[model samples]
Target chain A: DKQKAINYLMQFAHKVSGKYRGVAKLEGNTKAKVLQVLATFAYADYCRSAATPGARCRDCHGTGRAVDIAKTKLWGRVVEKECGRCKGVGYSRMPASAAYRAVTMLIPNLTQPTWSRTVKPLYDALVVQCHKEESIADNILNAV
Target chain B: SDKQKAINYLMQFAHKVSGKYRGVAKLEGNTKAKVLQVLATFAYADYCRSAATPGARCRDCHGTGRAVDIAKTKLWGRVVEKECGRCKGVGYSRMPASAAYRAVTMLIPNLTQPTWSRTVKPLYDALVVQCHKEESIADNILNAVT
Candidate 1:
């Protein structure tokens, strides 16, 4: 019953999409679907934490670390979910940026020659992180 | 015997291409390397035989058709003699040398850093496969030699 994770999901239901209110989902009763999904993430997050080494990581036998919810597919490809490692079986903390990273990686030749000046430098700076997250921030301004 | 086919030999490329040997020229070398080199220089439509009339129609691509799309490399891209299955069987016609040989570098301006390795040969013909009027059953019989 950890409400912390519950609140985290709430942050998303209201996350920006179009200029209109009630974003990332439709209006009325449909919003519960988003809550249901968030609840699953909350539960998954708990089990994952419990599964952490020395905790009850039944999936990896105590000392080992591995979780299923921590994986996803993107850009016609599948990749690991970020932030599930070294932690409990980890509930749904993040699947968005991982998805974005997966999208950037899976999508081949994912660069525009014109935007290279910015895209490449940004990629270099981030190396193996922050890119997808950056994309999210940049995309936020695209609100309709 | 006057080689009626040779006189009509024509290779199409941008501009007058080579101004020698019909219109185009022989670019023999590592074709793969040539591809990359061309890519680095300029990109263009997959193929277009010729814009202006080569003055002589062999068999395809205008009033002529190098025979037909199923004949050459569709829409007349590049016709390699080796591809025509030795010509006597199937391929674009050829013509013997007579006109000129222009440098590829000269044809392309600026050319800041061209190695000039594979491009500078004068245009030439296949020496096989004769392109000409729409072949009738009579022409086929003549070649088949009934």
Candidate 2:
């Protein structure tokens, strides 16, 4: 069941990446690299999927987003000022198009998991990553 | 030289200065006399403050350096001799740049009242009379005055 949940999360990530790509217009190669990195996080055992790990992956802030990986490096050094590749919405451009939207719409309503115990941890982890990313983004902009 | 008596008189005068009358302005038989009494109490408080160590001047009557000799002015068509400079007829000048002034003018009303034209009427009139004004946010005006 945990594995199934993880698989579902991976699929969800793929859909999100596709939508981001379509909306944001990221290059195909960049989108693929982002997907690969997210998959590595999502499927990793132990603290891989968790936001706070023994050794943080810096990428996706450990929430498995491609934009996060592109922006952060080892020891949390920001490699890019902004994820020009993701257009900063943190999703792939290809995923944001009508076709991806239509497909995602047909997927079983994950609202239950999103609000319930199953995805609560994931939701919290995502929120933490978002806050951290926003803080970093603000600091960078203020510095400029 | 009872300090409490002086303090009480000062307190009464302070209340009057803030436009609070301890007694009704209208009383049986002697309206002018009652007014004079009120004025006297206020004057006495001013005198006490003036005589004290700080030597505070009565900002209303004497500090303005105006003379109000009741003997010269006819009260009810009769003149009675009295000190010329008691309560300065000009009345007290509003304390400027004091916390009390700030509270009365801005902060207290801002916290307690709701925005209304009547509440800000004095400010509007003062602005117009002075012919020196700056536009403020209507929302802030509402917050401050209301």
Candidate 3:
């Protein structure tokens, strides 16, 4: 069953977004460009896999299993162990298949200055949103 | 006045012995006490000879029992004092400057590889001996003074 699930996920990944070869033999800017493309495809695949019903499993997302990176605090006095929900996995919910396709299409354009500048900002904004959600959840717990 | 006269006598004795033994002084004794005593006496005698004062010679040979036996033949009858051949009257000895000490001090930082068998180690050893001797003498002096 695990093997079947893995195969299904693998196939899903391939169909939604291609496999990534982290290696690049190309020179200078060409290598950078290729790496950027690979990163984009991989990111898109992850997004697509996340969107499926059993991709990340509803149990993980519904139970808030993923470690809230933004809520994580490190200091001498107070120590909090990683969330057992996702067992330290930062992501519980998967990205939609359409989101993956969108990202794949956006990858080539990302190399362009106009898109490149916007890409990092957009990713950063998404990360900020994730953090904000975690913060809101924390505040709700405190209120409770 | 007595100490001054004693010092003067010692100075004269040292000068005479140093002059006579000019190129040929043999230094002995691990401690420089004997050498210092010898120089003080020699200097005192020289001062006595040069002094116009009538009682200069009467001064206790600045603690040295014998006087300078200047009669080149009777040199042995004179005290068998530390010879002033090398450092002459100066109590301390100095070796010619080599890359030795510099090399040793340099080893304090990057002591990596080829190790200090020939160069720095020897210099460190010599410096250690010299410093130990000086420290011992310093402790003795401090004890005596305090």
Candidate 4:
């Protein structure tokens, strides 16, 4: 369990889309089904953790780094820093109202009740990872 | 003759779409977000083609859509080409280019019939050609060195 968690976290280190073999597996038509299962596992892991508890900060996805979407006036480029919501802890037991809006608006796949209780952490984690990837892609465009 | 013109058009189109000349070239009113939206298409295209594990080019046909049927020998036989056996003659092992095209449609889903056909379709078609040209150039360089 720890090894798998570490592996998933390590996937964050790769900026190149080609190197994101694990993410590539998560891509395509079956993404929602696969992500749902993965989110289930993430929720379970959150319950088991002792030192830091509650759904790993959906904002930062447990990376402790969150992009400043509001501050990002530029199209592709972004600036990231310690997550203001969780105060850099990367885990929060507290409820964030922003989560409700973000999940419902962006995904809109699951019921409101289900999203509140389950899978929010995993969904947040995925969004954060994707944003990271997008930032990398933007950098590539400017470089070329 | 016509192919070169198409490529040239795409080259210029890419510059505009990617915002290479955004600061210098005149643009429509309040279109920064629109530029990023189109930029996303190019980024996705880059992702599809750059994949290492599931590579952009076909393995069996090597992106030529042809397979070797009979090997050439000094005695009698000469090489014969046939449609690719693995990918149903598509020349794409994983259909990366097709995947990129699909992404374009998904990104911009609300275009009207005429606008979609006239604008977005041609833009994406030109990008595909540009990407193939990029790959071919790389291949040529590697071939020369080896």
What class would a CAPRI assessor give candidate 1's docking? Answer: incorrect
Q: How close is candidate 3 to the true structure, as a TM-score?
A: 0.20
DockQ for the candidate 1 complex? 0.00
Model 1 alpha-carbon miss at residue B18, Å: 90
Model 1, range A37-90, lDDT digits (tens) per residue? 333333443344444644433333222233234353334433433234535332
Worst 10 residues of 1 chain A by lDDT: A97-106
Local accuracy of candidate 3 as per-residue lDDT tens digits, B22-139: 1113333322234334334433333333221222211223212233335643666642443233223222222222233333234234333234344323332233233323323343
For residue B23, model 1's alpha carbon misses the true position, in angstroms, by 95
Residue A66 lDDT in candidate 3: 46
Candidate 1 chain B has its poorest 10 consecutive residues by lDDT at B43-52
Q: Could you tell which candidate, 1 or 4, scores higher by DockQ?
A: 4
By summed lDDT, the worst window of 10 consecutive residues in model 4 chain A runs over A96-105
Candidate 1 has an lDDT of: 0.30
Fnat, 2 decimals, each candidate:
0.00, 0.00, 0.00, 0.00
The DockQ-based CAPRI class assigned to model 3 is incorrect
Best candidate according to TM-score: 4
Tell me the docking grade of candidate 4.
incorrect
Clashes of each: 21, 16, 19, 0
